[PDB]
DNA sequence: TATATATATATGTGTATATATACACACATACATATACA
């Protein structure tokens, strides 16, 4: 590691924190991606969201989710 | 001109809340403006 400041090269591992956050993270490329959780089911047309991305505010993205006249076409009722 | 309404203001010490602007940038939603056509 003293070699490694020398030398501006990296040895040991620096990944993101994800402490109290229960989806997963995926490294592409350059950059991580944060991924929320659903659960799904045909027999009754239900997929449950269980988790939302890295600080991502639950109202805040579910009002998002309504604006969207693409996604509605689809979706008939939204409950918390 | 008279007897009679019903709404209206201000004081101190209290109880509750509302709203405009700057600054950067990744991201989302709305056309719309053409360009082959058709």
Redesign the pocket.
């Known amino acids: 590691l003293h070699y490694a400041i020398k030398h501006k090269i990296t040895i040991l591992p620096l990944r993101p924190s994800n402490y109290n956050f229960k989806g997963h993270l995926k490294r592409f490329g350059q950059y991580y991606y944060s991924y929320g959780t659903y659960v799904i089911s045909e027999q009754r047309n239900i997929i449950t969201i269980t988790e939302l991305p890295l600080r991502v505010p639950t109202v805040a993205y579910i009002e998002?989710?309504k604006?969207?006249?693409?996604?509605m076409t689809f979706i008939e009722e939204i409950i918390d």
């Open positions: 998002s989710i604006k969207s006249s693409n996604r």
